[PDB]
Structure formats: structure tokens, C-alpha cells
Symmetry: D2
Subunit: 478 residues, 4 copies
């Protein structure tokens, strides 16, 4: 019929071609010989085996990285505009294999294909294009200094950069770190999460195809306590970018000073409050806060369970809020109709349910859902809680799964104080129609980023270092 | 009960000590010996006489600025941070003689003394201080160019800058043109308006005192067709900054192209439409809309007489606004209770009246006022027009006086399309509590500046760009590395 | 091993497909029906006829651009990042058809094909790609202001932009104006030079093909006094960008001021003196000072003919230079061995010869060349001059042709004063290994740009194509 | 010829300020403990100062926190006002310039006229400079895909902890207090234990100038106590440290084990000097000389090593020995002294044992070599010759009146040698050859490179970005 069925479609015939270590544009086997399994979070099944990299592999990776960054290097003499062209060529290859890549992100990470294809991958391509445009626009400056002097600065690449990311948005994270860093001229030694190194490894292929000189990007799959720690402590690594759990960041900053005091960056958790006001149109408020709390199986750090709602509407919202969760299609990620895929791990799976129990046995009125779904996979039903208070464990601890707490507040000053209670880290999503309330909240919110009625230049600053030069001149004249 | 007048007081009948041309930190008489009167718009009585500059005087002024800007010059070798120290020192003096400068301001422009003291002179001091901090923070860049090259850019002063400003905010205008230009290292030949040259001449005194090298700032009171025209057509002036009527704006650019292609900046008037949605606190909207329309005697490019009010509340707004006018205190600018002083001239005066007559004799419902006040000075009573339509003349012609027109609208697009109708130039104030309306309206407004729930005296980093030119240098290097 | 593996060539008698006015992504014919010829500067022969635009034509183009910039507009709602992709797509299309484009550039302006291919179109493609990147990186700011307020600024496009450019680098010039403007969201009404509009119109074809909304780019071939004058006086163009002679520049600003006070930008000529000190590698210096004086047939504002050499090396330099000219290959621009092409006009041609003679009849020592070459075309032989002094007409007037004048000098304070003396407009190139001389000079040269040990004339460029809109909101209580 | 004097020390300077400064109040250490401060020229005790510890550092933070809380005066203060305060602070410093330079010259043993004309010049200058930055710190409006509007605000971090050395007490204190205050932060600064006077004094000025209570807190004391108390406090948002790398490692480690606060480290580093034969031997010798002996050599911005090109290695060493040979070492308050004492006995010994080391390894001790007399920590101007990369005095850094003079031949040589450094590097090159100046300046792995001599990025570590994006009905360019 007129069914426009033809749309993005995954690929069950997806056989993982890239499962080895990527160093100096070559696919190597782990020095030890060890190999680690990669599992499909929707069926419990094993997708394939990947070469487990360790201390030794990290050394070679770093060696190629430093060589690729040396003064002779093709990566060091290459015009900046060319680095951009390469980031741009890479973006083109990502578009070409957009499906097979979006498939791994679905297959390997359990994220509903249509979402992996239309959201995640859009970002991957978007950021690669965007940063490709920054390469030759990174500017230094000439400074007017007292005295017969002429000083000026040049922003230069730090050198060898170590990167370590989580499993929330495997490809996206990998890109968000690769682009900025390459953009600035650095060389990379990136360690993807152990439960999601596929798309990362695939990018390695595209990178070599795009034309990046050997040694610029090195991808070493393996375990955190091993490879990730060998990086965070490696002596010949100038900087390190980490993003994941706070408890592990501490080990990173500490191993940083211990080693060689290399520059360090940590992208840590943080709670994600939401403050819906009575003046906001209930309908739109519900959907958005519902998508903001359930997106990416609710297990994404950029999500936020807690949802402060104004009393005048606390009634309806709760009811509407549960109707949605009820109709939410949870199924196989390859199914174009499923909205919620499985959780990433059994370890993760339990930590969620285990916290769902806490709530129930503490006053939280379970409005719907509450337990897992079936055999295999790691699905959990859309859980919505009611009558929640700040002293509960489900309100204190963040729920990294399909669980949304609905709280109630009366005064403004209130929510501001309640939502600001966060020990480092915070993101807010206010919903109003009142310029004043919006302005006040977005200001009083001790949050790194605020959204009003919805749920760049500062990026490539940590991937470059300043080099000032000052020259004595015969006589100075403005 | 313990109410004492701690309040600042306008020095009684100030003695105008400065009335001559200011060149090379020296006070000269007019080459021709000509002279022109300065008058009190509040009484219509003369205040003093000022030397009259002309072609020949402008010429000596340009020679002065030129020499003060040459390669060896103290002003050219001075550290940027020192120019900053000078702008700040000048700010100190303005603060010291703040009372007498606000006195001339009020005495020559007929503006309420307390306003000239707390608003105008606050700004004078503020902008001076502000640019002082900018002097050593103007940076250039280093660019990554393909090839084994290294290019960079310095931001250097332009040279001699001619400046011409109006009578609306004599001291503010003078300051806004001076600070940025000196800040960047230029030399100035500035021509105040013929009706308001005093406050400016006094600044010449403080400039010499502060420490500015001779020739850096040259002030020449005089007329447009002569003094101003000689500046615009001058073969030795590198840049000219003008603010005033668009009619004269055209002569300035033409003179420029016809003479030496000097750089040209034009600050022209324009309409300043107001939009009041029914969801805005009606009380605060009447005060603000009233303050933005009748401020500085309504005669100020930054004031918008026309006011679009939403039907749902048109009724009320018209009533609240007339009360405000009736209670509007209009008196001698030295009385600390006067909220409105006289219009600047008889010419201005007449233009407002005859224009007001039009409205009345065309449909507009004259809610109140409509004629002048007593004898002496150029005071006009707070007029308020209602049932005004776009087609009307008062609607198409701006009202540079104590006159406000209230119009009614229904849809949003309407207000927007209607308000947007203008020719090159537009400032706009909007009042709502609806974030969406504020946003739609703020973006859709073809204006250079938009205020949301406030008016404020209109017109940073973008300011000192016009007072400096870019110089780039690219060096061939052995090999380019990251 | 005799590797006759070659592969870079024009196109056999190219058929000029695009010769009509380009409005609203549509090819029109002049309202009047008038037409002007375009000629091959090498043969003197006619290449084709182009529709000649005038007042009326300009009006429609302005109308289409106007509509293309109005609120709801497709080009106005487009994401900035999308405007950028469009410029990148245009870059791609320019890459695909690079051969035909460089052919026209050569065939129409008379510049050696190989140079047009590897230089001019590299620039076109490079600039297009470059600005395609700036599109979503034009930021405004949040300003810490006094009181309980919050002010922020937005850099919006100006509106309808007229653009008028010369024949020196047809495609390069065109690109340099289009990219910055489109990159900022404006709409354009562009008028190429009467002697070189082909590459221009072809770009119109590519523009439509790339995806640009109709009305965004309008291209109108025609004459200066008519079409160019109607753009400068048009009551509905918000800004004009002109590059050409200072004499015409003067007229542009006047018309600007006498009409609607549109923004005006003038890219005028100027002198481009070079300075050569004994400490520089005489060999290298001669090679750079040579290309930079004979490049683009010497008729490139981005390069002067005057060269100040230090007494110590003046001798060897004069000989080193003459030997270079003597070995310069002038001939058909389609022949890959040719370095120098024909001058652009009969008019420009005579102006060069009359000027050469002048030098001869005034004392300058003609070391070589001094007259045209053969019949057909406007070629002039590499002409070098020795013993030249400032007071000489040739020294005072620019020699927009294949002619280098070599002036002698001794003290630094000297050259620095001589090089400077100029009425609005200066660019300088200095060769030395002395950080000191290089410094004193580069900071003393009243030039807009200065080259040290090289010679071949960003963020500030996309500033003239956008204006500032500052918004400020009143807020309950302000906190840092 | 009859002459006159004008620039002079505050006679028999008495120390009015010796307590801890918290909430614009002078408190006594909780423990009640007190520590001494000494004159490095004589060795005698100048006075005693209250000693802060974990519990004191605790009150300060409470003070700073409250002073940074929303409603606060300092948080609502127009940004232009923070600048006026800084400027008034610069004025108050100009007024008491003489006595401040006195303490700096009496506490750290630096020659008064330099402490007056140099050190204090920088204190006032940098205070004036940042005064001017306070209302010019901008965020941006970013064009975003979709119907959105996103903007950023550069806001102050909050509570900053500062720890500086004794090389330039006041300057250091100033360089760290200015940017931070300029950005709206509140401070808890800990001066070195051997030089707290000038700092504590500034405390009085800060209060006099009008800074609200709790914005700045000066807690003098020891590092393993006060310094660590700061580094680990759970309520300090950011920490700025400048000093030795060995302690830096403890700093970063501590901040990681605690609350993951931001950490900055201004650490050591060698300051090589390369001199070519083409540079003017005269200028070159005097410049390299002043650059290695300034502040008595005991200052990070001083580099012992001085690579000289063979062609002129001869004369350079001679002209240099003559220089050292005529350097006047005397009392800090005598207008003719060019070199005061070393800050400490501990630092004193180190310098000597390191001098003996060189002599005992091949170095050709051209002049000087030992201390001077009794009382004080003076050390005669030392100058080595024929030094090689392997020699200890060359590998390790000499923070005293000691200058080495290595020899070299090719450019590639010096570039490789001088470049050899494990994190941290600054360099000076002398030539009249643009190329060498370029090849070298870009090949040097230094944060800064000086050529023929020896801002905006500063106010960046004291603020964070807060991006906000609003949904709008429909977007238009
Ligand atoms: O009307 P308005 O009174 O508000 O201001 P205006 O436009 O008449 O005049 C404003 C300023 O422009 C000057 N001016 C007037 N005509 C001039 C001319 N012909 N050429 C050069 N300068 C001229 C005035 O003297 C004044 O300083
Ligand atoms: O050379 P230098 O010897 O002056 O450098 P240093 O690191 O010994 O001294 C610099 C500053 O760091 C402080 N400090 C010392 N050890 C510390 C520690 N363990 N943790 C926190 N603060 C400490 C000092 O008291 C001083 O204020
Ligand atoms: Cl004329
Ligand atoms: Cl006319």
C-alpha cells in the first residue's frame, strides 16, 4: 500500500568486523592475548569478543601518540584548515555508515534504533561538522603592554591526551571528546567503556579511511581498573579527560598528581531537578518532563527523576504523568515502535529495582510499574512515584532508570532551596510562562545549565594551552 | 519631623568662566573675533557669549590634533594604561565639580537639576570610568594561516577624529564621544551644539587639569553650516562621528565622500514605539510609559511618544495616563520638585505646538494639555492624545516634546507589523509577563535595542571598534608547527 | 623514466551557457533587451554577449532579495549551521566544475589557466569552506550591567546588500564578497565588472543548484554608470560593498549619503612598496620581489611595482631582476608554459605603454622591454626600470602592468619616510633578517597590512556584514 | 654639588598588624599558639604572629561562604563597584607605599628601592588593571539549531583558597587576590610562614577600602597545618597554589580525596637563557646578569643556566665575572645595595652545598663561592664557567646568586638541551636574527619566551560558565 515503510532500518546481519586494538592506524591483538566479551543488553546474548588491552598496549598507544605529535610529524605541520577538512571527511563517512553505526549503538547498548539513528548519530555528525569548522579559527592575541614591548600569544595543542568515557552515549561521548581534541591538534589515546567498545572501534576504521595520520587517534578497549588506570597514570601523557562516576574521578585526580601532575578534566554526575509551575501548560509540561526523565532508558546522567510540581496542579500532573508511563512501549530496540529499551547491565538492572524497593518501603506511593519485565534482557517497567519527600532515599539518591518521582511545592523560594541542595553538580529544567519566575529561578539555580520550557567556544579551551611571547622593540608607538 | 535639605544644590547664579575656543590646552578668541549668545531656555534670558569658531579655527584645531598624534608625540608613546589613568583622573575632577557641571547642564539645557545631577552626570562619570578600564585591554589576534607563515594584528588609533553632537544631552554626548576615542589613542576636534556649548567648554578646563597632552582634545563652539561643515569636509581629519538630524546626516556623508573619504559614523534619530500587553501590571506600565515619553522634556531621540496599548486595557490605561500628566510638575529647573523643564528653543517649541494642533485638527482626542505655559522660557503642558491612528501626522511624525499618543491594538502580529513600520532606525520597549510574547516581540522588532519592562536612558565592547583601525603583519617563518 | 603522466587542462572552446541576468534563482533577459559584448583579452576576439542590466533590472533583484530576507522567510528561519552547509555545498560544486570555472577566469580575464586553477580557485574554494565554518560561530554577548537588569546582544544580518567589484580577480572578488555576507544571513544583489562577468554568472547556476533559497543571491551584469549607480542609490538596499578606484569610490559614498544613508564600505587601491635590505638573501628576494610585481600581469592592486633596494646590493639586484624578466614566458594563457597573460583592456594597455614611455622620456633607465608584443591581444613585454627617483611620474603613479621600477636607498629613516608618503592606502613588504629593522619598519609603515620576507595580498571580515541588537530585561534582584 | 633625598623607608618600622584576619576582624589563634617572623639581613626576630590551624581555616571558610551567599551585599554589588573597590585598594596601597615596601624589604630582605620601585609598582598596577576588568567579563549568545535561544553567564565560583610562597610576598598575594575578587569570589588566602606581614597589612587596607566582611580572609601560619586545612576543606570550591612541585602533588591529591574542588598549580621550572654571537655582547651580558641575580636569585622567574655561543663564549664569561665582581651586597635599607640576603638559613645552606657541589664536579668557579659575614644570610655573587649538562648545579635549580655559563655550537643543540625539562619552562633568547628568534621561540616548550629581554587569560580560572537556553515560539536570524 501507500505505506512509506522505507525508513531507517538496522541490520541483523551486523557482524562485528572490528574487535581488535587500534594503534597507529593498525589493528592489533592484546599483548597478553586476553579477550573480553561484549553482550547485548536486550537478550543477555553475547555479540562477540574484543581484544582486552592492558598496561603494555597502553604504552605502545602512547608511543605512537607522541611520535604522531613530534616536530617532524605530518599531524604537526599540517595546516589547521586541513585538520578541519579531516574532521569533516570523518563526518561524511559517519553519514555513509550511519545505519551500521546506529545499529551497533542499538545492538551493543540497547537503545531504540530510531532514536539512536535520529538523535545520537545526528549529534555525532553535527559535532564533527561543527568542530571541523573551529580548527583554523582558534585565535591567540596581541596584548598592549607597558614598556617598549610587543607581546602576543599562540594557542597550541597540549600534546598526548588520554580519554575515558562511560556507556551512556558510547558514540556520542567518543565524538564529543575526539572532535575538540583533534580540532586543537592533539593526539589521542581513548579508552571506551568495557561494555560498549564497538561503535568506538568502528570509528577507528572510518578515521583511518578519512586520512588521519597514523598515531593521531588510538582506541584501546578494556577494563577500567586496568587500561583506564594505566592511562590516568601514564608518564608520557600530558592531559586526561574523564567522564563517568564521581567515585572513579577521585581515583583519576589522585593518580594524576601521583604520576606527573598532567592536566586533568572530570565530567561527573549531578542531580537533575525539574520545576513545573502552575502557569505552565500542563500538557506540554507532562510530555517533556516525561521524556526528560525516561529518555535513554532513564539511565542517562542528563536525565532527572525528581520533578517538583506546583500544588495548584500537583493533582492532574500526577494523573497525566502516570497515563503516559502506562502507554510507554517497552520492547526490543530493533522494533520501530519501542520507546524504552533494556538497562545496560544486570549490575545496573538490580541497583535500579533495589532502589525502587527502598521507595515503596518508605512512603513512596507507587502509581504504576515497579518491577522488571521478563526473562533475558534487562527491561524494567515505567515506574512513577507519588507523594515523595526530600528525606527519602529515592529523592536523595538519583534514579538512573525508568523512574520518575513527583514532588509537590507551594512557594518559589522553596523549590529554589530544595533543588539547589546538591553536593557539586547540577542541571535544572524550569517550566513556566512567567518571565520573572523563569528569570529568578534560572538565576538562583546553582546549576551548570538551565532549561526554560524544554528539557561551543568553551569546549576547545581544555584541549589547548597558551604560549605567550614578548619582544623588545626599539621604540613603541600605539 | 527632621526633614533637612542635605540635597545637592545648584550653585546660585553660576559665573560662566569658560567661553572661548579650546585648542592645544590654550583658550583662544575667534580668529574673526565673532561671538554668539547662549540662552536660558527656562527664562529666555541670555547667559553669556561664546567665541565663534569657523573654517580658520577648525584648521588650527586640526593642526593641533595632528601634531599631538604624530610619531614622536607624548600621547603616541604613552602607555595604554596611562591613557586609562588620564580618563580616570578626568572622572575624578568631574565628580569634584559635579555640582557646577550639572548647574550648567540645567542652566543651559533647562533640565531638572536633580536629574542632571543624579542621572546625566552619573553617566558622565560612569562612562569615563568605564572606558578608562578599557584602554589597556584592547587586543589584536594571532591567526593560524595556511603555509609557513605567522600573521598577527595590532589595533591602532585612527588619528584625528572630528566629532559633532546635539543639544539633547550636551555633557553626556560629549563624554560618549570623548571617552572611547581617547581610550583608543585618537586626538579630537569636537564641535558642541550652538545652543549648548557650556558644559563642554568647562570639560576642556578639567582636561588640561587632568594631564592630557596639548592637542589631544580640541573643543570648538560654533555653528553647523560653518564650523561643523569645515570639520566634515576637512582634508586632514581621518574620521568623523556625528549624531543629530538625519537631514544633516546626509550632508555629512556627502561631504566625506566629496572630500577625502574619511571614515563616517552617523547616530541618527528614529521612532521609539512602546508595547503594553494586558498581562503587564497596569500601574507600573503607566509610570514607565509616562517616564519614557516625558523624560528630558520629551525632546530626546531615546523617548518614544507613541504607545500601543492592548484593547482589553486601553480604557484604563488612557485614564491612568491622563492623571499622571495632570499631576506632572512643570517648573523652573532649579526647583527640586520639577519633573519637566522647558523645551530647548522657540523653534522646537513652535514645532511641537503646531504639531499638536495637527493631531487635534485631524481626529486625535485631546485628553489634556495642548498649549504652552506662561511667558518667558519654552514650557509646554503635558499633552496626552487618544484614539490616535497610524495614518495621522502625529503618528507618522515623531513628537520630540512632552506629548504622548495612545493607540489600541488587538493581535500580536499587528502591533509588531505596525510598530516595525519605520525607515532606518528603531528602539523599542515592551511590557509583559509572558516569556513567549517578550521573545517573539523582542526578536521580530527591527530595532537596534529592545527594552523589556523598563525604558532607561538609551545608548560597550562594540563601542571602541569605530575608534581604531586594524593593522596586520605576516611573517615568513622557516617551518610552521602547532 | 619519461613519465608523460599529465592531467590538468581547460576545456576546448567552452560554450558560455550562462549569459543572462540572475534574479530569484531565475535567468532573465534585460528589461530593455540591451546587450553588451565580452571579449578575449588575448585575441581581441569576442567571446559572447551578456544581458545588460539597468535601473529597472536592479529594482526587481532588490525586490527578490527583499522578499528573501523577510520574517517568515525560509532563508531567515534556516539554522545558522544550515547556512554554513550551503556554503560548503557551494564549495563542493566549485570543486567539481573547477576546470570550467578556471577556464572562464583565464578565457575572460586572460590569466594563465594553470595559475587560475591552482591559485584563484584554491582561494575561492578555501574562502567558501572557511566562512562555511563561521556561520554558526558568530556570537553576541551577555554584559554585566549596573542595576537589577540583564542585557544581552544578538548579531543579526543587515538586510539587502549591494556589491560592486572589479576585473582583477573576478571569481576571487565575487567569492570574497558573497561568502562573508551569506555567512551572516544577508541577501545579496551583486554587480560584477563589465569586462569580466562570466565566472560570476556561472556561480549563479551553482548557487541555485547548491540549494540556496531564491532571492538570496542576485547577480546583475551591466555597466558602472547605470547598474552600479542604481545599486548605490537604491532606496531599498541596506548596505553596499564597493571595491575599485578611489575616484568611483567617492561617488559611491556621495550617492549613499544622498539617498538612504545605507552602510558603505570602500575597498580602494593603493601603493604596494617593497623594501630590500642587504642582509636579505638576494636570490630569494629577487624571486619574491619579481612574482609580486609581475603576478596577475602586474595589474593586481595587491602588488606594487616599486622596489626600494639598498645601495650595497642595488647592483646585483638590478641584474638579477633583468635576467628574470628576460626569461619570462608571455603567451596564450591556455599554454601551460606561459607565465604572463595579456593585459585586460585596450584602455588599460595604452595606459601602461604611455606610462612606460614617460619613464624613458624622464630619465629612468629602461633595462628591458618597454612596448607591446604582437598584434591581437594586449600583451606587453616584461619591462624593468633602473635609476628611478620619486619625482618621476612612473614612481608617483601606480603601474598596474608588467613593469618593475627599482629605486636605490641608503638610510632606514630614509626608506621609511619615502615608502610611507601616500594619500590614503598603503601595503608594504620588507625583506631582512634583522629583527630590529623588520620591527621598526613594520611598526612605522602606515600600512593596513605588512609582509616580512614574503609578499601576496578573517574574524574582522564578517563584522561589516552584521549589526548589533542589544536587548535588556528588568529583573527582580540581580546576583553575580 | 648639593643633593637631595625623597624615596625613604618608614623609620624603625613597628608591626601594627599581627593577628589573623577573618570577617574584617583581627582574631587570635584558637589554639592560642603563636609563631615568630624574622629579618633575613640580621637574623633577629622582627615580631610574632598568631598561628592559624585547621580550626581557624574553618571559621574563615564559614566567613567567606556567608559573604558569598545569594542575598549577600557582595553578590548583589554591581560589578562596576567591585572594580571601584579594587581601585580604592590600589589607592590605599599607593598612600602607604613606603611602609609596605618597608615590610617587604624588612621581612624578605629585598633591597628597599627595588621593593618600592618594582614590587609595589606591580601591586598597584595589577590592582588597577583588574579593577578595570570587573564589568567587562562577558558571556555570549550562541546561535543554536532549532527554535531555541541559548546564552552563557560567567559567574564567580564561590569560595577560593589561596596559598603562596615567599619569593614576592605582596606581589604574589596581590596577583592572586585581584583576579579572584575581580570575578566576585570570596577568598581564604594563606601567605608563606616566613613572610606574612605585608599580607596581614593589606588586610587592614582591604577593610578600610570598603570590602564587605568575609570577602577576604588572611590566615598566616604553616603549610602542613593551615595550607593543608585549606586544600582539604569540604567547603572550599577552588584552590590556587603556587610554590614547589613536591607540595603541589600533595595539593592536587588532597583536593581529590576531599570534595573534587578545582585545582591550579603555579610550580617551578627552569628558566634557560640562550645567547647567540650576533646579539650585542654588552646588552646581552647585563641583561642575562640582572636576570639571574634579581631578587637575590631566589625566585622562580630567575634562571641560573645561560647557554652562550662558542664564537663569543670567551668575552661573555669575562664581562660577566666582572659584573658579579662589582655587585654591591649590603643591607636592604641602604640605597646602594643591589643584593640583599637569602630568605632562610635552610635556603642559605642549600645554596652553598650546591655551590661546593659544582666546584667538586669540574665547574670553574670564576668568582665568589661562599657566604659573607656574621648575622644575616648573605652570599657573595657566585659565577661558574665550563659547565656541562651532567653537572648537578646544572640539572638542579640554584635559587640564589649563582649563574652558570654553558657553551654551545649549533642552534639545534641549544634547542634540544634547553628544551630538556620535566614540566615547566620559560626562556630568553638574544639575537638580531628574526629567523633564529622564530625557529627558537616556537621550538621552546616554554609557557613564555623572551626575546632580547628577560591578562584576559588570568581572570578565567576564577569564574565558571552557566549556560541557559530558552524555548521560543519560532526562531528568526
Ligand atoms: O535638528 P537638531 O537641532 O536636533 O540637530 P542638527 O542635526 O540640526 O545638528 C546637530 C549638530 O549637527 C551640527 N550641524 C548642523 N548643520 C550642519 C551642517 N550643515 N554641516 C555640519 N554640521 C552641522 C550642529 O551644529 C550640531 O552640532
Ligand atoms: O619553595 P617553598 O619551599 O617556598 O615552597 P612550599 O610549597 O614549601 O611553600 C609554598 C607555600 O606552600 C605552603 N605549604 C607547605 N607544605 C604544604 C602542604 N603540605 N600542604 C599545603 N600547604 C603547604 C607553605 O606554607 C607556603 O605558604
Ligand atoms: Cl566635487
Ligand atoms: Cl538632493
Amino acid at each position: 500500500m501507500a505505506s512509506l515503510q522505507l525508513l531507517p532500518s538496522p541490520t541483523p546481519n551486523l557482524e562485528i568486523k572490528y574487535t581488535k586494538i587500534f594503534i597507529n592506524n593498525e589493528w592489533q591483538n592484546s599483548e597478553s592475548g586476553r579477550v573480553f566479551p561484549v553482550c547485548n543488553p536486550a537478550t543477555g546474548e553475547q555479540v562477540c569478543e574484543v581484544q582486552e588491552a592492558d598496561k603494555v598496549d597502553i604504552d605502545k598507544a602512547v608511543q605512537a601518540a607522541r611520535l604522531a605529535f613530534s616536530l617532524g610529524s605530518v599531524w604537526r605541520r599540517m595546516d589547521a584548515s586541513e585538520r578541519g577538512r579531516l574532521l569533516d571527511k570523518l563526518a561524511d563517512l559517519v553519514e555513509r555508515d550511519r545505519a551500521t553505526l546506529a545499529t551497533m549503538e542499538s545492538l551493543n547498548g540497547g537503545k531504540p534504533f530510531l532514536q539512536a539513528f535520529y538523535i545520537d548519530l545526528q549529534g555525532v555528525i553535527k559535532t564533527l561538522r561543527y568542530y571541523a569548522g573551529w580548527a583554523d579559527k582558534i585565535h591567540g592575541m596581541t596584548i598592549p603592554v607597558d614598556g617598549d614591548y610587543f607581546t602576543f600569544t599562540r594557542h597550541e595543542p597540549i600534546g598526548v591526551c588520554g580519554q575515558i568515557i562511560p556507556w551512556n552515549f558510547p558514540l556520542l561521548m567518543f565524538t564529543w571528546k575526539i572532535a575538540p581534541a583533534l580540532c586543537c591538534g592533539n593526539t589521542v589515546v581513548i579508552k571506551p567503556a568495557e561494555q560498549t567498545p564497538l561503535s568506538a572501534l568502528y570509528m577507528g576504521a572510518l578515521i583511518k579511511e578519512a586520512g588521519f595520520p597514523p598515531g593521531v587517534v588510538n582506541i584501546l578497549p578494556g577494563y577500567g581498573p586496568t587500561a583506564g588506570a594505566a592511562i590516568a597514570s601514564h608518564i608520557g601523557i600530558d592531559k586526561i579527560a574523564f567522564t563517568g562516576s564521581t567515585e572513579v574521578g577521585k581515583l583519576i585526580q589522585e593518580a594524576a598528581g601521583r604520576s606527573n601532575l598532567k592536566r586533568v578534566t572530570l565530567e561527573l554526575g549531578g542531580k537533575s531537578p525539574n520545576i513545573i509551575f502552575a502557569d505552565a501548560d500542563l500538557d506540554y509540561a507532562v510530555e517533556q518532563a516525561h521524556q526528560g526523565v525516561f529518555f535513554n532508558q532513564g539511565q542517562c546522567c542528563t536525565a532527572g527523576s525528581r520533578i517538583f510540581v506546583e500544588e495548584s496542579i500537583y493533582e492532574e500532573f500526577v494523573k497525566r504523568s502516570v497515563e503516559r508511563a502506562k502507554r510507554r512501549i517497552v520492547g526490543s530496540p530493533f522494533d520501530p515502535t519501542t520507546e524504552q529499551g533494556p538497562q545496560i547491565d544486570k549490575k545496573q538492572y538490580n541497583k535500579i529495582l533495589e532502589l525502587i524497593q527502598s521507595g515503596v518501603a518508605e512512603g513512596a506511593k507507587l502509581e504504576c510499574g515497579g518491577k522488571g519485565l521478563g526473562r533475558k534482557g534487562f527491561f524494567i517497567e515505567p515506574t512513577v512515584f507519588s507523594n515523595v519527600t526530600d528525606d527519602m532515599r529515592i529523592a536523595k539518591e538519583e534514579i538512573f532508570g525508568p523512574v520518575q518521582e513527583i514532588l509537590r511545592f507551594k512557594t518559589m523560594d522553596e523549590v529554589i532551596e530544595r533543588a539547589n541542595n546538591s553536593d557539586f553538580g547540577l542541571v535544572a529544567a524550569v517550566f513556566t510562562n512567567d518571565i520573572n519566575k523563569a528569570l529568578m529561578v534560572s538565576s538562583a539555580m546553582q546549576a551548570g545549565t538551565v532549561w526554560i520550557n524544554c528539557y561551543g567556544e568553551f569546549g576547545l579551551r581544555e584541549y589547548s594551552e597558551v604560549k605567550t611571547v614578548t619582544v623588545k622593540i626599539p621604540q613603541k608607538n600605539s
